[PDB]
């Protein structure tokens, strides 16, 4: 005479005194830190910086998506605190789950576009500049909003308030009926919410890794030649000359490997001349002719009296790229595994309430690590900007 009455297979699954106490406490921390954290991000990025880059648009919408999810968070904290009892009705049930699902798909899709933007702004800054305008930045977002809504559309449909017959506990959840709701609901979160975005983000930063590694390896090969060439100028015997000429010959071969991305045949031929000029200098060092080999190595720098500006570069960028990929991986792979197991329990192989408990006990644990590490995404991505860090520390 009202809502749908459901029989629960494993009613005592995930119900523990330590889950009802720790989970709402962590939700309050995520609520306090998330709101205080993300709100200040949207201030600096809009009122202090006026949104003039494409990443600035992605960063603002990334923080607003987290802010929308945090507003519905007080509903889930008390929901867990009441031993999973939902009094908020069916209206807030369809909205709370949709808001959590929408913002989780939107935040991951936004991190995907941010990676594609960094790959374009680094490897091809000149060509991709005219394509990456401010209009495309706002158009990309409304495509993400529509995709995050369409992917979370089954969440607004199959999320009803149910009354368990054998426990008299009214809950808001998904009804995994025997047959006659799609099982692809849990799959979409695994492939569209993790697999597909991770393979695109990893490919972007890996291509940035290989692009920056080639640039720094080439920069260090020239540094290897110039530094060793100054050792010949201050050399004494033929042993100290051959030791430096042997290191320069390997550096010329390593620099011959780098190739961005007839023009490249001229690049490698320019180093075959370099290696060839090192061979003759090595021939004089093997015979024991120091002052003659010193002139052969000094004629090498004939192509080069004003000191020029040095190329700025950081060796710590690889720590950032690796941390960015791992911080996204190890923050969703706990929730993605226990969700994949749920798909096996949903309609398949697993028929045991003893292991269905470890799924419902560790699910809010994985939701907290997914929620806490995602609500800090716009903050830490923003700290990677020298201009953003200065304004944020002033507030």
């Amino acid at each position: 005479d009202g809502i749908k009455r459901i029989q629960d297979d494993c009613p005592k699954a995930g119900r523990h005194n330590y889950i009802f106490v720790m989970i709402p406490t962590l939700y309050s921390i995520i609520f306090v830190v998330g709101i205080f954290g993300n709100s200040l991000v949207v201030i600096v990025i809009y009122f202090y910086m006026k949104l003039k880059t494409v990443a600035s648009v992605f960063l603002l919408n990334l923080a607003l998506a987290d802010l929308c999810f945090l507003l519905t968070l007080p509903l889930w904290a008390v929901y867990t605190a009441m031993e999973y009892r939902w009094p908020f009705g069916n209206y807030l049930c369809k909205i709370a789950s949709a808001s959590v699902s929408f913002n989780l798909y939107a935040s991951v899709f936004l991190l995907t576009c941010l990676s594609i933007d960094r790959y374009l702004a680094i490897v091809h800054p000149m060509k991709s500049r005219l394509r990456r305008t401010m209009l495309v930045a706002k158009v990309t977002c409304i495509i993400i909003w529509l995709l995050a809504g369409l992917a979370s559309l089954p969440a607004i449909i199959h999320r009803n308030v149910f009354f368990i017959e054998n426990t008299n506990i009214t809950v808001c959840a998904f009804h995994y009926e025997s047959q006659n709701l799609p099982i692809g609901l849990g799959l979409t979160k695994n492939i569209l919410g993790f697999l597909f975005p991770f393979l695109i983000i990893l490919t972007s930063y890996t291509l940035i890794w290989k692009a920056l590694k080639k640039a720094y390896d080439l920069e260090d090969n020239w540094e290897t030649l110039n530094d060793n060439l100054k050792v010949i100028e201050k050399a004494d015997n033929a042993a100290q000359v051959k030791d430096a000429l042997t290191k320069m010959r390997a550096a010329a071969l390593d620099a011959q490997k780098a190739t961005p991305p007839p023009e490249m045949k001229d690049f490698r031929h320019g180093f075959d001349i370099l290696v060839g000029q090192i061979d003759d200098a090595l021939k004089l060092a093997n015979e024991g002719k120091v002052k003659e080999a010193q002139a052969a190595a000094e004629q090498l720098k004939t192509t080069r009296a004003e000191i020029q500006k040095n190329k700025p570069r950081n060796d710590d960028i690889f720590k950032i790229i690796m941390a960015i990929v791992l911080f996204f991986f190890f923050s969703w792979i706990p929730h993605q595994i226990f969700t994949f197991l749920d798909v096996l329990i949903q309609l398949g192989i697993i028929r045991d309430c003893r292991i269905a408990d470890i799924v419902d006990t560790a699910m809010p644990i994985t939701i907290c690590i997914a929620y806490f590490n995602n609500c800090l995404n716009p903050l830490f991505y923003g700290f990677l900007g020298k201009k953003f860090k200065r304004y944020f520390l002033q507030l």
Partner: peptide
Amino acid sequence: DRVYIHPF
């Protein structure tokens, strides 16, 4: 019949 009480 399974009940998935979790937020997502």
